[PDB]
Design a binder for this molecule. Structure first.
Ligand SMILES: CCCCCCCCCCCCCCCCCC(=O)OC[C@H](COP(=O)(O)OCCN)OC(=O)CCCCCCCCCCCCCCCCC
Ligand SMILES: CCCCCCCCCCCCCCCCCC(=O)OC[C@H](COP(=O)(O)OCCN)OC(=O)CCCCCCCCCCCCCCCCC
Ligand SMILES: CCCCCCCCCCCCCCCCCC(=O)OC[C@H](COP(=O)(O)OCCN)OC(=O)CCCCCCCCCCCCCCCCC
Ligand SMILES: CCCCCCCCCCCCCCCCCC(=O)OC[C@H](COP(=O)(O)OCCN)OC(=O)CCCCCCCCCCCCCCCCC
Ligand SMILES: CCCCCCCCCCCCCCCCCC(=O)OC[C@H](COP(=O)(O)OCCN)OC(=O)CCCCCCCCCCCCCCCCC
Ligand SMILES: CCCCCCCCCCCCCCCCCC(=O)OC[C@H](COP(=O)(O)OCCN)OC(=O)CCCCCCCCCCCCCCCCC
Lengths: 592, 504
């Protein structure tokens, strides 16, 4: 097949046409171009999957050209497709198509319509390049494009300076993560002589027979890039502070493309991560820690968007935990199910923002179960998939598979972290929906409402032969359902006097304010990075090196002004200076 | 026999551009375009007939073309020109930049425009001459003779909104920096020629005969230091960068003098062809100092660029940071890093040309260069903020542009050689993203900060827009397909690398 290059080229064509359109086209024409390019990519992905399952799920390679060839440095411009690439491509294309349809409905009467769709098409193109590249440098191309498109999409309403500040923060934090990823690329080329994923996996055990320090460094820097893009520790503040953009931007970033790039990077490089078990368990610890902080921070937020952002944070932490406990199939399955229900939740949140006015607070509003039953039902089923209602939602099955991977690998701390994370997830989710909703049948809403039930759990990712198979189950299902049920019942019981009594207490208020400030990571990152940067920039705004190199001009001017005093115009002094020079010349000649 | 004509065509074109001033004011721009297109087409013809993708490194000296005619036979001085892949890439680059400079200085309907064109072609022909000369005195002559035209069109034709004293000060600073460093290079050249004459008996200024000069380590170090100071003024290397932002800011407001004189770095070529082959041991000992000066240049240029309120000074400091990257690349001794440095030189030329042309158009649109006086310009202009976004993305180091190919290939080779410097330089790439986004947010995003930014600005002319789009297309082609450039420069880069590493 010659259709993977089509899945790259079609969103590229959409981006180029809509960017050079510059808003002169109608809304219908620009919507047709952007949504049609993304839908054509989705249809070509569907046909690629049909052809993939027609054969024996064989890995396919499509080279195009050689990107660079300097001696032994041979970086090729080749695409590859296997089960993991097909799963990520299908998720990206389908969820992006649904978000594009909802955005075409949602962006009516908005300036920058074609610019919005050009940026989202370039986002889809960059992530398709990211998931289809057979080597790390082409994947870095896709990584950088995804970061640039996220920067362009977060600061879409560029007139508000807060939006631009959030976009700039997201771009700088992700660029730090990509510099870590670049370190990984440099290490892997310097050691193995290649950046092809299959070739690196084949060449790593032979090369790293005596020393294994450089492979551990490379996998640690790969994890650094992954937590850069997936908004984990210690590069996590951008997701919380960068929801100032539009709602379809948030849906795309949180479900389709941006946060799933790190999970894909860990899954694709699993052969390198398996040779460094300490780094893989460090991936698990990073996921568990980010899980805990996101769950604790999500309850104390007072906005729907920030709660959904920390929900995305917590679920990406679940996927990172699953990769750490070598539950690769569970991690990818949770990626697809979380894409479905988080896209659904963001669509319902955008609908309830449009139903309300000026995006008001969640505490003063309530009793929306009668005015808007449809948005309430969509939000309820999205939360149930988020909070793992047993045997009715796909998220329950995905979290059950992740917890079974935690069972089978003999990790205790990650297990209890996942269990209390599931509890905390149930509490914050049902808290938020019962605070907001208590006291038109759009087709994408119905599609990811169906996909948030067990119908989405019926889809099995074809990761056999690509990712290694994951290695009591009834008791785990019972205790997970019990934890989710008691979290639901507790959040229904409280949320309103006891919550005010707990919050108004000084330890309670201190903990609530500490968890509202992203565990103080924004302040810490400001005081260690942003404030000294501005201090050094203010110290170096007048070019001190230029002044120090201009010092000889000042010395020359001073010396010339001093020497010009001897040209006073007096003939007697001229005769005196002649006699002084005669004395000096005679004395110097007599000395030597 | 085209290199003597490669230097002579710009000279005769500028001379006849001055001569045709009697026939009109709208006339010499067409003659300028004709002679720059002729030089560019001749360079493209010599590229197409060169066959640089099928030649192997056979030892320095190895030229595609060569020519020798005795100029001062008393000193053994001759017009000695030669060309290979790297030199031809440089001459094609300055031909394209001169065409862009002529197309940028369009509609300058004024008296003595023919002399402005004459100075421009003297600068461009001089840059071609230093790129082609392989006689040391001839190379130094060409090196120092861009100085009078550049000085005169900075001091007399410069930024007219500023005072005439400021333009004269910037021009004199640039002249004093470059000419003093050139005189230091002349001292090094004379000492090398005399050392070869004493050790052998043959008196010459030929580069190919001065290569086999037995000398002590200290004398070779001093000769290398003279050459390096001459190249470090023009590279620019900190702290000898100070002439560059004022020379850019007091350059003529069209944005053509930057392209003609500054935006191709003959200093990196000079280091590659003269500092490494003539003094390989001294360059090997000097490499850590040059690498740390490059790191300091990267971060200092980034911090300097962030602190500016002027766009043009910001872009000049971006040039300082990128040339710090190139300076790190040159002293690695790595073929991959050398090829990355060549790609980075070309990509920096194209991207900085686009940035300076867009800044000039913005200044003609809003009559100010202060970033506190604008904001929200995305809603006021039709083409300028998006092209500026592309070029800030390019000099940010984004894959898909040639800057990424050059920068990351430099970093791959450097990490093979020097890992810590590579790590610090990649954090310099983070700093590059920071200043690019700062410039984009200050200029084109947010609300209008004054009254001139609140009005619908006039659109872009088709010639300016089309050459900006040509630069965009060339940068994208360099990012996605840099293989013809690498195949062109591979033989020369390999010969320089092999001479550098087999002599130490
Ligand atoms: C991750 C990106 C995936 C690829 C798609 C888009 C690529 C970027 C498009 C813009 C830049 C293109 C520059 C490169 C073009 C191809 C260069 C090349 O080498 O072509 C020759 C190659 C056949 O020869 P080759 O395989 O190289 O043989 C080895 C030589 N001994 O020829 C072939 O194999 C045919 C290749 C056809 C490619 C068609 C691309 C169409 C793109 C349309 C949208 C353009 C968007 C431009 C802007 C993008 C963002 C900057
Ligand atoms: C390979 C798959 C992806 C992998 C990752 C790739 C990452 C690298 C991509 C590099 C390109 C730069 C990316 C960012 C460019 C942003 C430009 C932009 O903002 O375009 C939108 C803008 C229209 O927006 P609007 O606000 O409506 O209009 C302004 C006037 N009122 O548009 C305009 O105003 C007009 C267009 C401005 C310039 C558009 C981009 C030019 C560069 C890319 C195309 C180059 C030419 C194509 C052919 C290349 C050679 C084959
Ligand atoms: C672990 C979770 C155990 C369940 C009980 C504590 C959490 C529920 C609760 O009521 O927390 C109170 C407070 C967050 O309550 P919140 O809705 O943000 O307050 C609004 C009123 N100003 O939460 C806190 O102040 C911190 C609670 C720590 C326990
Ligand atoms: C302020 C701006 C201007 C810059 C400063 C002015 C120039 C300063 C030059 C200082 C030179 C110091 C030389 C010290 C030893 C002199 C006596 C001696 O023993 O000379 C040795 C040697 C002659 O002995 P012989 O054996 O015949 O030579 C064969 C060489 N293997 O001698 C030789 O072979 C000749 C050695 C020549 C050395 C190179 C001279 C130029 C070096 C570049 C310029 C100076 C350094 C950089 C600039 C400094 C800061 C501005
Ligand atoms: C009003 C303003 C003007 C007046 C005030 C300002 C000062 C003006 C004068 C500045 C220049 C001072 C003299 C510099 C040259 C000194 C030469 C010297 O001492 O040479 C000694 C020795 C010669 O070599 P030797 O070892 O004898 O060889 C035979 C056996 N090997 O040499 C060696 O062995 C090698 C010695 C190398 C180090 C000496 C040169 C230092 C140069 C410093 C500047 C450049 C630093 C590098 C680049 C920085 C960034 C651009
Ligand atoms: C230690 C292990 C873990 C390492 C990784 C995790 C920690 C690093 C995370 C860094 C996050 C920094 C985020 C900064 C976002 C700033 C966004 C922003 O809008 O900043 C404001 C300003 C915007 O510029 P302007 O357009 O002019 O706006 C008007 C001015 N307010 O813009 C600015 O003021 C510019 C701010 C520049 C920030 C530079 C950050 C550099 C990060 C380097 C990380 C190095 C890690 C290792 C350190 C050494 C260890 C030995």
């Amino acid at each position: 097949m010659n259709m993977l290059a089509l899945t790259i080229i079609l969103p590229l064509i959409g981006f180029v046409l809509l960017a050079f359109s510059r808003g002169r086209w109608s809304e219908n024409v620009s919507a047709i171009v952007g949504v049609g390019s993304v839908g054509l990519a989705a249809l070509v992905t569907a046909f690629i999957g049909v052809d993939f399952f027609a054969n024996g799920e064989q890995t396919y390679s499509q080279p195009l050209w050689t990107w660079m060839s300097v001696g032994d440095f041979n970086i090729g411009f080749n695409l590859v497709l296997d089960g993991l690439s097909l799963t990520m491509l299908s998720v990206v294309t389908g969820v992006g198509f649904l978000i594009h349809m909802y955005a075409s409905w949602y962006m009516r009467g908005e300036e920058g319509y074609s610019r919005f769709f050009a940026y989202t098409n370039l986002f889809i193109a960059s992530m398709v390049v990211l998931v289809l590249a057979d080597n790390l440098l082409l994947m870095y191309l896709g990584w950088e494009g995804v970061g640039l498109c996220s920067y362009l999409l977060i600061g879409f309403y560029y007139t508000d300076p807060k939006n631009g500040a959030a976009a700039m923060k997201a771009f700088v934090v992700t660029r730090v993560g990509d510099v870590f990823l670049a370190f990984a690329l440099f290490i892997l080329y310097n050691e193995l002589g290649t950046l092809n994923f299959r070739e690196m996996v084949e060449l790593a055990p032979a090369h790293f027979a005596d020393g294994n320090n450089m492979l551990m460094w490379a996998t640690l820097m790969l994890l650094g890039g992954a937590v850069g893009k997936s908004a984990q520790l210690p590069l996590q503040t951008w997701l919380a502070d960068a929801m100032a953009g539009p709602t379809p931007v948030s849906a795309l970033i949180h479900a389709a493309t941006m946060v799933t790039a790190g999970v894909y990077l860990i899954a694709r490089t699993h052969g390198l991560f398996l040779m460094t078990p300490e780094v893989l368990h460090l991936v698990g610890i990073v996921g568990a820690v980010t899980l805990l902080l996101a769950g604790f921070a999500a309850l104390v937020q007072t906005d729907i968007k920030r709660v959904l952002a920390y929900s995305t944070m917590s679920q990406i932490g679940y996927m990172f935990l699953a990769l750490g406990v070598q539950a690769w199939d569970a991690a990818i399955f949770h990626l697809m199910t979380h894409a479905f229900f988080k896209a659904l939740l963001f669509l319902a949140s955008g609908s309830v923002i449009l139903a309300c006015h000026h995006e008001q607070n969640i505490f003063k509003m309530g009793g929306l179960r009668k005015s808007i039953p449809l948005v309430y039902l969509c939000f309820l089923v999205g939360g149930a998939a988020l909070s793992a209602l047993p045997l009715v939602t796909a998220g329950f099955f995905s979290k059950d598979e992740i917890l079974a991977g935690a069972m089978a690998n003999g990790h205790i701390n990650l297990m209890v972290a996942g269990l209390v994370g599931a509890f905390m997830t149930s509490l914050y989710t049902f808290r938020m929906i019962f605070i907001v909703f208590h006291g038109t049948h759009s087709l994408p809403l119905i599609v990811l409402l169906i996909l948030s039930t067990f119908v989405g759990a019926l889809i099995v990712p074809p990761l056999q032969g690509v990712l290694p198979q994951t290695t009591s189950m009834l008791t785990l299902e019972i205790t997970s359902g019990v934890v989710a049920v008691v979290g639901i019942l507790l959040a229904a019981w409280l949320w309103r006097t006891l919550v005010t009594s707990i919050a108004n207490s000084a330890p309670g208020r201190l903990l609530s304010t500490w968890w509202y400030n992203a565990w103080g990571f924004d302040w810490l990152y400001d005081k260690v990075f942003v404030k000294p940067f501005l201090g050094i920039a203010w110290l170096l705004k007048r070019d001190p090196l230029n002044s120090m190199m201009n010092i000889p001009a000042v010395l020359s001017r001073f010396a010339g002004k001093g020497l010009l005093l001897s040209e006073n115009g007096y003939l007697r002094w001229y005769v005196a200076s002649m006699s002084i020079g005669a004395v000096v010349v005679l004395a110097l000649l007599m000395v030597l | 026999m085209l290199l003597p004509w490669l230097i002579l065509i710009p000279f005769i074109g500028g001379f006849l551009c001055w001569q045709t001033e009697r026939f009109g004011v709208k006339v010499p721009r067409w003659i300028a375009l004709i002679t720059m297109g002729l030089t560019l087409a001749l360079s493209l013809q010599l590229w197409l007939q060169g066959g640089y993708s099928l030649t192997q490194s056979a030892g320095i000296p190895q030229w595609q073309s060569e020519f020798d005619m005795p100029w001062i036979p008393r000193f053994g001085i001759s017009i000695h020109l030669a060309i290979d892949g790297l030199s031809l890439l440089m001459v094609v680059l300055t031909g394209l930049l001169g065409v862009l400079a002529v197309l940028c200085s369009w509609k300058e309907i004024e008296k003595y425009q023919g002399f402005f064109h004459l100075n421009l072609m003297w600068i461009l022909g001089g840059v071609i001459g230093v790129f082609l000369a392989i006689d040391m005195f001839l190379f130094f002559f060409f090196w120092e003779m861009m100085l009078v035209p550049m000085y005169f069109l900075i001091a007399l034709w410069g930024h007219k909104a500023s005072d005439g004293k400021t333009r004269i000060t910037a021009a004199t600073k640039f002249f004093i920096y470059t000419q003093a460093s050139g005189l230091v290079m002349l001292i090094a050249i004379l000492a090398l020629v005399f050392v070869h004459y004493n050790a052998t008996g043959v008196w010459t200024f030929n580069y190919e005969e001065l290569l086999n000069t037995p000398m002590s380590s200290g004398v070779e170090y001093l000769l290398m230091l003279g050459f390096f100071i001459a190249f470090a003024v023009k590279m620019p290397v900190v702290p000898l960068h100070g002439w560059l932002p004022d020379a850019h800011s007091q350059a003529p407001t069209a944005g053509s003098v930057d392209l003609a004189g500054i935006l191709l770095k003959t200093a990196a070529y000079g280091l590659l062809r003269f500092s490494l082959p003539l003094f390989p041991n001294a360059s090997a000992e000097f490499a850590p100092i040059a690498m740390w000066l490059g790191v300091i240049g990267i971060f200092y240029g980034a911090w300097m660029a962030f602190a500016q309120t002027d766009i043009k000074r910001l872009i000049a400091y971006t040039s300082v940071s990128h040339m710090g990257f190139v300076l790190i690349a040159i002293y690695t001794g790595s073929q991959l890093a050398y090829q990355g440095a060549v790609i980075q030189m070309i990509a920096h030329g194209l991207s900085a040309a686009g940035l300076f042309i867009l800044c000039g158009q913005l200044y003609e649109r809003i009559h100010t260069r202060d970033m506190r006086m604008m904001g929200g310009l995305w809603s006021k202009m039709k083409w300028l903020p998006a092209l500026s976004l592309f070029f800030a993305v390019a000099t940010l180091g984004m894959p898909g542009t040639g800057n990424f190919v050059g920068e990351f290939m430099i970093l791959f080779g450097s990490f093979q050689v020097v890992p810590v410097i590579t790590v610090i330089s990649t954090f310099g790439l983070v700093f590059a993203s920071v200043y690019s986004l700062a410039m984009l947010h200050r200029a084109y995003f947010g609300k209008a900060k004054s009254q001139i930014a609140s009005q619908e600005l006039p659109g872009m002319s088709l010639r300016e827009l089309f050459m900006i789009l040509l630069l965009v297309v060339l940068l994208v082609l360099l990012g996605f397909y840099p293989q013809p450039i690498l195949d062109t420069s591979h033989s020369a880069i390999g010969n320089i690398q092999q001479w550098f590493v087999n002599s130490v």
